[PDB]
Design a protein around this ligand. Structure first.
Ligand SMILES: OC[C@@H](O)[C@@H](O)[C@H](O)[C@@H](O)CO
Lengths: 423, 418
């Protein structure tokens, strides 16, 4: 891929990031009346009125503004916005009796769901660690560490390893099945690898290094498919595969059958998840100062599977999910999987040096810019038909904020520059 | 055994406990000048001079006095002694910057080894949880929980499970080999199960219940021999068996008996089994929850470890059943007293009561130094002392007082069952 093409792709991202995506959030999100962030915007960019400030929404905003700022974007206001978020997290969402952050507040900042959900706590560590790295405000590291310590105490399974993932306010484990107390999941464990990476970057402490590596090992040895290297979504405590169910606590709009199961509840993998894992693993290794070769086999399997099955060569973009063995189940185009495939395919090129990953990359890039970005507003359509007709028309809500897309724009520029240097 | 036999065994224990063993300690150990306990006593019961107040000696002292008091012995003085030791643990041995208890102080109470040693921290959780149950003073639970949380943060391996076991003062992992940072041991993980049982008994919180069960599962699934159910002493972090090594940090003496990596300890295995049954009692779960495991430990101990000729239990032998070391060490006798009684309660086979009486007669007739009230630490197979200290930095009164008290508890259960 020529230097001119590299530079064209990079300029397209940068101009869109600076004049479309960040302004969409900068001009809308700060709630000065109640604190924290407004994130419910309809297809016209107007508040759609939902009475929710979710942990995911608030922490993802903190992460986005901290990380965009630390990467050099937004012109200064992003750090101030992140600090605004962190105030909300601590003053409204931190449990001062039992510790940990609450799952849901309403718009006034009152607690409506007081459960302790490791998936959200993962995003608390991630975003508050990134916030301290970006601003030097020690509150971020302080609460990331508090939350890390509570996860070790209450969530780590000292026999089988890994983490139980959903608890009541008082940290007692929730019941079985949909209540979320008896499964260990790819989604939590991968995002913990992501959070621990930044926590370690922030603190430099051995325990955080040692447990980041323990988490990588868990993912690679237990969560990934033993043959195909692809992420298996759900396990019992003993790491035997569990039927993939919807939980009572959601943080996305994942499709299930009416009984709350996936159609192939035991043979279902997500190309976006697998690409996301692979590049976040490479980023952890960078932070650890280890070569990508440390997990060459795993990284190769993740990227190879994704480009072989998940890339829609004919119409552009990445499918939703499919079989570990190769069959596609759902050819719709959901926003966050495009974002994660952008980063992953550049890193697959950087590391594996196969032009097919650059071919895959521009495919996904062209789909994102020509079909998925709602250019009049600056945000991404959340769900489209295979061929790129919008199905869902919200710009954002309690679970779709700006964590995936801002990160993929910044981190795609980052890897395009590294590619450009290698001639 | 007859009601009359049980009553005699019980009275032998009870008289010795009240007139011999506890007075030995009550009259010697409280150090009012420096705080804490003196535990260095020679064969004549006199101070032998050592300049050490180990974490093991102090916390084990707190446990003995807390538990003997809670079971109703000592006419009250043992709670006052336990309190004295807790004062020392907190004010001289707790690390106010990094948390956890230091491994070693000197006689004046100054820290001399500031490492964080999980084996010692186990006994901190054990003794301090017992202290709060025994006295209602919440300092015990408070530091027991603080120690537990630190172990979850710094020592639990979130990948392979179980604990790394030795750390610098600042909780950074120590180095490989003798430094202690790359092995997982039966010693630490069995005693964590012991400690967590009393911690859960103390707090009643679900997290301690859940992690007690997890520790039991680690022992049963990772530490006990896959075929024989006997304890394997050392593992790599991945739970593959490691060559047995001595660590720089010791809590005992390496006896070289002048008369191998498949060796296991009959006393450890008996100890694990009865502590497991006690954990199951605290949990409300039936013994046969782990029937196969418990049957293996006790069966292997009675078949191979009991010296029918001279009395007492041997030191160690192979998993497959060959005896290696026929010397008579004090703590294995104590743990077989409790274990053989529990083996009879659960398995109902008469050989365990024959075994018990064998160990009991060896303890009372050969091993107790009846002029002082403490046990000889190590004897030849036949019953001649090899070492003659009564107590030091690692031999206190944890094993023996507990075995007297807990043997009475179980003899009383067996007598009702007859
Ligand atoms: O790894 C991707 C993430 O965990 C995804 O599963 C969430 O559902 C989505 O990011 C929320 O919009």
């Amino acid at each position: 891929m020529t230097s001119e093409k590299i530079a064209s792709l990079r300029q397209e991202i940068e101009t869109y990031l600076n004049t479309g995506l960040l302004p969409f959030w900068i001009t809308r999100t700060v709630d000065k009346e109640n604190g924290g962030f407004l994130t419910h915007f309809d297809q016209f960019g107007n508040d759609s009125g939902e009475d929710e400030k979710s942990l995911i929404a608030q922490s993802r905003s903190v992460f986005t503004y901290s990380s965009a700022h630390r990467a050099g974007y937004g012109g200064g206001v992003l750090a101030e916005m992140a600090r605004h978020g962190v105030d909300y997290l601590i003053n409204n969402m931190w449990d001062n009796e039992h510790g940990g952050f609450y799952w849901m507040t309403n718009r006034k900042g009152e607690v409506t769901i007081d459960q302790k959900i490791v998936y959200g706590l993962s995003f608390c560590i991630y975003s508050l660690s990134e916030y301290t790295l970006a601003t030097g405000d020690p509150r971020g590291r302080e609460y990331a560490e508090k939350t890390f310590d509570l996860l070790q105490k209450y969530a780590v399974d000292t026999h089988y390893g890994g983490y139980f993932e959903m608890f009541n306010r008082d940290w007692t484990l929730k019941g079985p099945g949909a209540a979320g107390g008896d499964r260990k999941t790819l989604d939590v464990h991968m995002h913990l690898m992501e959070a621990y990476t930044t926590l370690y970057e922030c603190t430099g402490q051995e325990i955080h290094r040692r447990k980041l590596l323990e988490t990588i090992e868990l993912l690679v040895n237990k969560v990934m498919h033993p043959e195909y290297g692809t992420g298996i979504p759900q396990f019992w405590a003993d790491w035997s595969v569990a039927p993939q169910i919807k939980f009572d606590i959601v943080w996305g709009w994942d499709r299930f059958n009416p009984d709350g199961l996936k159609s192939a509840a035991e043979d279902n993998t997500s190309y976006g998840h697998n690409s996301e894992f692979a590049w976040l693993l490479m980023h952890a290794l960078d932070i650890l100062g280890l070569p990508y070769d440390t997990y060459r086999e795993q990284i190769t399997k993740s990227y190879t599977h994704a480009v072989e099955n998940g890339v829609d060569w004919e119409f552009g973009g990445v499918y939703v999910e499919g079989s570990h063995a190769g069959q596609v189940y759902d050819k719709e185009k959901e926003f966050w999987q495009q974002a994660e495939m952008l980063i992953g395919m550049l890193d697959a090129y950087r590391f594996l040096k196969d032009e097919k990953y650059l071919q895959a990359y521009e495919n996904i890039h062209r789909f994102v810019f020509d079909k998925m970005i709602n250019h009049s507003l600056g945000e991404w359509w959340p769900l489209m038909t295979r061929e790129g007709v919008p199905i869902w028309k919200h710009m954002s809500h309690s679970w779709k904020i700006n964590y995936h897309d801002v990160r993929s724009m910044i981190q795609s520029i980052v890897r395009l520059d590294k590619i450009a240097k290698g001639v």
